[PDB]
Design a binder for this molecule. Structure first.
Ligand SMILES: Nc1nc2c(ncn2[C@@H]2O[C@H](COP(=O)(O)OP(=O)(O)O)[C@@H](O)[C@H]2O)c(=O)[nH]1
Ligand SMILES: [Mg+2]
Length: 167
């Protein structure tokens, strides 16, 4: 009685992959979550009248688990932090890896700019928009601290997966 959606959260160390994921599952902000825990979580959530069981891999480091989620994951959150220019620059590499594993430029994906609550961003919203536009994907700004944008990011990914394949 539910539809399963397999999601993978990727991006540089420190950007808030775990904090976003924990926020979605537990509705709290974690200051410090072991930066080495790579694991999968499950959330049941009704999105547009469909009961979804999200199977989410929170990636960490560099794994037999990750290989399978990369091959069989249906959508990707590609996360950078708006105060980490290098994490933004790194997106290209995460997107390239995903394209290669899928042999496709048409993979459900959302670009996520995290830590929107922090002052004096170094990556402007227009830089991120430019990048998401060239990739043909949505850009969503989040804060795992305030929860701004968190459900938006995950719901939008679910919708991008549907736009791409029957579920
Ligand atoms: N202020 C703020 N800090 C955050 C946010 N997201 C994560 N952090 C902090 O940034 C650090 C890295 O977060 P983490 O979730 O471990 O990153 P990961 O390596 O990508 O899983 C931790 O100290 C978090 O508390 C956010 O949206 N706002
Ligand atoms: Mg982590």
């Amino acid at each position: 009685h539910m539809t399963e959606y397999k999601l993978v959260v990727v991006g540089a160390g420190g950007v808030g992959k775990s904090a976003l994921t924990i926020q979605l599952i537990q509705n709290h902000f974690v200051d410090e979550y072991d930066p080495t825990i790579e694991d999968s979580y499950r959330k049941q959530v009704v999105i547009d009248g469909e009961t979804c069981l999200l199977d989410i891999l929170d990636t960490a480091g560099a794994s037999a688990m990750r290989d399978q989620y990369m091959r069989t994951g249906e959508g990707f959150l590609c996360v950078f932090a708006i105060n980490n220019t290098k994490s933004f620059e790194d997106i290209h590499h995460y997107r390239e890896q995903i394209k290669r594993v899928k042999d496709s430029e048409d993979v459900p994906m959302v670009l996520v700019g995290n830590k929107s609550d922090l002052p004096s961003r170094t990556v402007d919203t227009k830089q991120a928009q430019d990048l998401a536009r060239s990739y043909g994907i949505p850009f969503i700004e989040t804060s795992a601290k305030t929860r701004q944008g968190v459900d938006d990011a995950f719901y939008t990914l679910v919708r991008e997966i549907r736009k791409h394949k029957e579920k």
